[PDB]
């Protein structure tokens, strides 16, 4: 990707990854889209992203979310800044997706 923003003021939208993870097996909530659907940090609903139906970009919007994940390739995007974002509080839920996409961490134990 480009070179993402190191911090950004919306942060505080990350929450804690949920109980069951982040499966990026997950379809669109909305309209069962298969391909290029993203997870809210916040909430952790999952839409598709604005090359399908564009429900990521209404729901974050409507709920004031602005910070979202891809299940296409992890990066982080910010709908506030309009840019993606790199910062140690994206690290748990990079990680958890990558466990799911991947079958390991980011960084496995040896
Ligand atoms: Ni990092
Ligand atoms: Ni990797
Ligand atoms: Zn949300
Ligand atoms: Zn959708
Ligand atoms: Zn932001």
Same mark, same amino acid.
């Given at each position: 990707?480009?070179?993402? %923003?190191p911090?950004?003021?919306? %942060?505080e939208?990350?929450?804690?990854?949920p $109980?069951?993870?982040?499966?990026?097996?997950?379809?669109?909530?909305?309209?069962?889209?298969?391909?290029?659907?993203?997870?809210?940090? &916040?909430?952790?609903?999952?839409?598709?992203?604005?090359?399908?139906?564009?429900?990521?970009?209404?729901?974050?919007?409507?709920?004031?979310?602005?910070?979202? %994940?891809?299940?296409?390739?992890?990066?982080?995007?910010?709908? $506030?800044?309009?840019?993606?974002?790199?910062?140690?509080?994206?690290?748990?839920?990079?990680?958890?997706?990558?466990?799911?996409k991947?079958?390991?961490?980011?960084?496995? &134990?040896?």
């Amino acid at each position: 990707g480009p070179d993402p %923003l190191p911090w950004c003021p919306h %942060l505080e939208s990350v929450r804690p990854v949920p $109980a069951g993870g982040i499966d990026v097996f997950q379809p669109c909530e909305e309209c069962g889209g298969e391909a290029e659907n993203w997870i809210c940090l &916040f909430c952790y609903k999952v839409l598709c992203g604005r090359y399908v139906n564009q429900h990521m970009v209404t729901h974050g919007q409507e709920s004031g979310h602005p910070v979202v %994940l891809s299940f296409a390739d992890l990066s982080v995007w910010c709908y $506030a800044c309009e840019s993606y974002v790199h910062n140690k509080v994206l690290h748990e839920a990079k990680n958890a997706a990558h466990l799911v996409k991947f079958g390991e961490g980011i960084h496995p &134990f040896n």
